[PDB]
Amino acid sequence: SMEQVAMELRLTELTRLLRSVLDQLQDKDPARIFAQPVSLKEVPDYLDHIKHPMDFATMRKRLEAQGYKNLHEFEEDFDLIIDNCMKYNARDTVFYRAAVRLRDQGGVVLRQARREVDSIG
């Protein structure tokens, strides 16, 4: 139908916007701490601690499959990156500290994203 197409164009444009959001958030991680999944070869107990692992490469795969229906779903995955890190790693670690800085700096980007998503519909 024409409606299904219109809907598909909306999703494509959301995907376009979320791709720009993702790039902006990932720039706030210049150390690439959150770029890839925690390695289960190198941290073999990880899934005993963290039940829903997440990382920027995994978000990108979902994004490019158009698997984010709305900004909330995208934000859920970003929050998992941060929250998983802040539980697994102690406060006095470069990992924890990187998550805090990513959360703080990401907030600005996500605040405008939500306005843009609502604005453009």
Q: What is the DSSP letter of 52?
A: S
Resolution reading in Å:
1.5
Enumerate domains of the chain plus CATH numbers: 1-121 (1.20.920.10)
Residue 120's nearest CA partner among 63, 71, 60 is: 71
Technique of determination: X-ray
d(CA 60, CA 64): 6
Could you tell me if residue 87 is left (phi over 0), alpha (psi between -120 and 50 degrees) or otherwise beta? alpha
d(CA 110, CA 30): 18
